[PDB]
Design an enzyme around this catalytic site. Structure first.
Site, PDB file in Angstrom:
ATOM      1  N   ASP A   1      -7.241 -12.643  -1.886  1.00 11.05           N
ATOM      2  CA  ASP A   1      -7.173 -11.119  -1.810  1.00 11.05           C
ATOM      3  C   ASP A   1      -5.515 -10.390  -2.051  1.00 11.05           C
ATOM      4  O   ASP A   1      -5.018 -10.067  -1.007  1.00 11.05           O
ATOM      5  CB  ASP A   1      -7.697 -10.407  -0.518  1.00 11.05           C
ATOM      6  CG  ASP A   1      -7.531  -8.654  -0.692  1.00 11.05           C
ATOM      7  OD1 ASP A   1      -7.770  -8.199  -1.712  1.00 11.05           O
ATOM      8  OD2 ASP A   1      -7.113  -8.161   0.322  1.00 11.05           O
TER       9      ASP A   1
ATOM     10  N   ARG B   1      -0.985  -4.491  -0.110  1.00  9.05           N
ATOM     11  CA  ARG B   1      -1.469  -4.208   1.298  1.00  9.05           C
ATOM     12  C   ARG B   1      -1.021  -5.623   2.019  1.00  9.05           C
ATOM     13  O   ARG B   1      -0.766  -5.623   3.209  1.00  9.05           O
ATOM     14  CB  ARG B   1      -2.604  -3.510   1.552  1.00  9.05           C
ATOM     15  CG  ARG B   1      -3.604  -4.299   1.104  1.00  9.05           C
ATOM     16  CD  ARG B   1      -5.162  -3.666   1.118  1.00  9.05           C
ATOM     17  NE  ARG B   1      -6.073  -4.529   0.575  1.00  9.05           N
ATOM     18  CZ  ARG B   1      -6.468  -4.353  -0.991  1.00  9.05           C
ATOM     19  NH1 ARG B   1      -5.906  -3.649  -1.680  1.00  9.05           N
ATOM     20  NH2 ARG B   1      -7.346  -5.435  -1.322  1.00  9.05           N
ATOM     21  N   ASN B   2      -1.490  -6.598   1.442  1.00  8.08           N
ATOM     22  CA  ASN B   2      -1.076  -8.215   2.051  1.00  8.08           C
ATOM     23  C   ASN B   2       0.278  -8.678   1.652  1.00  8.08           C
ATOM     24  O   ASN B   2       0.468  -9.997   1.786  1.00  8.08           O
ATOM     25  CB  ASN B   2      -2.146  -9.013   1.790  1.00  8.08           C
ATOM     26  CG  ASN B   2      -3.544  -8.549   2.242  1.00  8.08           C
ATOM     27  OD1 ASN B   2      -3.740  -7.936   3.230  1.00  8.08           O
ATOM     28  ND2 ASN B   2      -4.560  -8.663   1.321  1.00  8.08           N
TER      29      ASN B   2
HETATM   30  C1  LIG Z   1      -0.484  -7.813   6.585  1.00 13.95           C
HETATM   31  C2  LIG Z   1      -0.535  -7.660   8.063  1.00 13.95           C
HETATM   32  C3  LIG Z   1      -0.307  -6.480   8.941  1.00 13.95           C
HETATM   33  C4  LIG Z   1      -0.250  -7.020  10.062  1.00 13.95           C
HETATM   34  C5  LIG Z   1      -0.004  -6.021  11.460  1.00 13.95           C
HETATM   35  N1  LIG Z   1       0.433  -4.859  10.791  1.00 13.95           N
HETATM   36  C6  LIG Z   1       1.847  -4.448  10.653  1.00 13.95           C
HETATM   37  N2  LIG Z   1       2.428  -3.207  10.790  1.00 13.95           N
HETATM   38  C7  LIG Z   1       3.646  -2.900  10.455  1.00 13.95           C
HETATM   39  C8  LIG Z   1       4.409  -3.974  10.483  1.00 13.95           C
HETATM   40  C9  LIG Z   1       4.023  -5.609  10.577  1.00 13.95           C
HETATM   41  N3  LIG Z   1       4.743  -6.568  10.566  1.00 13.95           N
HETATM   42  C10 LIG Z   1       4.351  -7.841  10.396  1.00 13.95           C
HETATM   43  C11 LIG Z   1       3.161  -8.538  10.550  1.00 13.95           C
HETATM   44  C12 LIG Z   1       3.319  -9.575  10.321  1.00 13.95           C
HETATM   45  C13 LIG Z   1       2.195 -10.790  10.478  1.00 13.95           C
HETATM   46  C14 LIG Z   1       1.372 -11.023  11.824  1.00 13.95           C
HETATM   47  C15 LIG Z   1       0.702 -12.148  12.023  1.00 13.95           C
HETATM   48  C16 LIG Z   1       0.095 -12.560  11.011  1.00 13.95           C
HETATM   49  C17 LIG Z   1      -0.815 -13.590  10.886  1.00 13.95           C
HETATM   50  C18 LIG Z   1      -0.699 -14.493  12.123  1.00 13.95           C
HETATM   51  C19 LIG Z   1       0.136 -14.212  13.274  1.00 13.95           C
HETATM   52  C20 LIG Z   1       0.676 -12.897  13.120  1.00 13.95           C
HETATM   53  N4  LIG Z   1       4.743 -10.115  10.528  1.00 13.95           N
HETATM   54  N5  LIG Z   1       5.346  -8.878  10.451  1.00 13.95           N
HETATM   55  N6  LIG Z   1       2.731  -5.689  10.735  1.00 13.95           N
HETATM   56  O1  LIG Z   1      -1.109  -7.973  10.125  1.00 13.95           O
HETATM   57  N7  LIG Z   1      -1.010  -8.473   9.109  1.00 13.95           N
END
Ligand SMILES: Cc1cc(CNc2nccc(Nc3cc(CCc4ccccc4)[nH]n3)n2)on1
Length: 265
Positions: A132, A136-137
């Site tokens: 995917d 957005r990812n």
């Molecule tokens: C793609 C995605 C988005 C998110 C959570 N939403 C979000 N919104 C604004 C900023 C932001 N910054 C992030 C998110 C991450 C990755 C988080 C993560 C993923 C996998 C395992 C552990 C932690 N980094 N910066 N995120 O989540 N995914």
């Protein structure tokens, strides 16, 4: 859960903060680093299976500049906290939309494409298939670095949080025959390029699933974006080749985007 001293961070080294979307922002400590932490919401064991899987898959994939890299985990004597790189500007769609004119140069936009292609080539070299890939990812750091997300992770009618359908990124062979390869990801890459050059545009607006299927079967292809050179449009169309073997690879795409970035104003 068994201790992995390569990765384990003591709980008292993590200061939890504001929610991000269960993903919170946090500070890992004599210098503090802003990180993102994922944790389980009342949840299934499966949900715990899925969480641990995501983390272990990140352990294997290795480090690259253009992917969200694992930084640590809290696994002992508490809930599981997976700790990864923080990207302060959100997904590539939001980043793009927020910089629409009433700013990003041509070279900037091409540069984004190059970086996503770099991230994908690395993940591919590590035998990883996204399934995917989309703006957005892809997350954007404070230094404007593209980092691919959700690479360690169906109802064709379920819409995203923002009212769009994921089937619209899916190559035909994946959509109709559920055959997923690096070449299906390249298809999705072509759609993601379209997003970049329409500054976060939505593909096939107003087209539901069934009509989507009709378009693909008839060989339909998205129109060229207005802020797009013929070369970049041809790159998209080559990504959307009917025959998967005839699509470019991320290696090819990286090399072509490198050259283009260079010659873009
Ligand atoms: C793609 C995605 C988005 C998110 C959570 N939403 C979000 N919104 C604004 C900023 C932001 N910054 C992030 C998110 C991450 C990755 C988080 C993560 C993923 C996998 C395992 C552990 C932690 N980094 N910066 N995120 O989540 N995914």
């Amino acid at each position: 859960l068994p201790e992995d001293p390569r990765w384990e961070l003591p709980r008292d080294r993590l200061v939890l903060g504001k929610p991000l979307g269960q993903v919170v922002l946090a500070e890992a400590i004599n210098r503090v680093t802003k990180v993102a932490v994922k944790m389980l919401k009342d949840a299934t064991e499966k949900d715990l299976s899925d969480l641990i899987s995501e983390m272990e898959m990140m352990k294997m994939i290795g480090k690259h500049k253009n992917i969200i890299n694992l930084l640590g985990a809290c696994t002992q004597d508490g809930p599981l906290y997976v700790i990864v790189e923080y990207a302060s500007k959100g997904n590539l769609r939001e980043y793009l939309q927020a910089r629409r004119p009433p700013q990003l140069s041509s070279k900037d936009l091409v540069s984004c494409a190059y970086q996503v292609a770099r991230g994908m080539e690395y993940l591919a070299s590590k035998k990883c298939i996204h399934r995917d890939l989309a703006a957005r990812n892809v997350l954007v750091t404070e230094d404007n670095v593209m980092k691919i997300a959700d690479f360690g992770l169906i109802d064709y009618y379920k819409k995203t949080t923002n009212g769009r359908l994921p089937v619209k990124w899916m190559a035909p062979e994946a959509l109709f025959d559920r055959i997923y390869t690096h070449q299906s990801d390249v298809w999705s890459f072509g759609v993601l390029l379209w997003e970049i050059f329409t500054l976060g545009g939505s593909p096939y607006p107003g087209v539901p699933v069934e009509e989507l299927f009709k378009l693909l079967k008839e060989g339909h292809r998205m129109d060229k974006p207005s802020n797009c050179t013929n070369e970049l449009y041809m790159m998209m169309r080559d990504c959307w080749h009917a025959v998967p073997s005839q699509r470019p690879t991320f290696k090819q795409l990286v090399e072509d985007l490198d050259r283009i970035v260079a010659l873009t104003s």
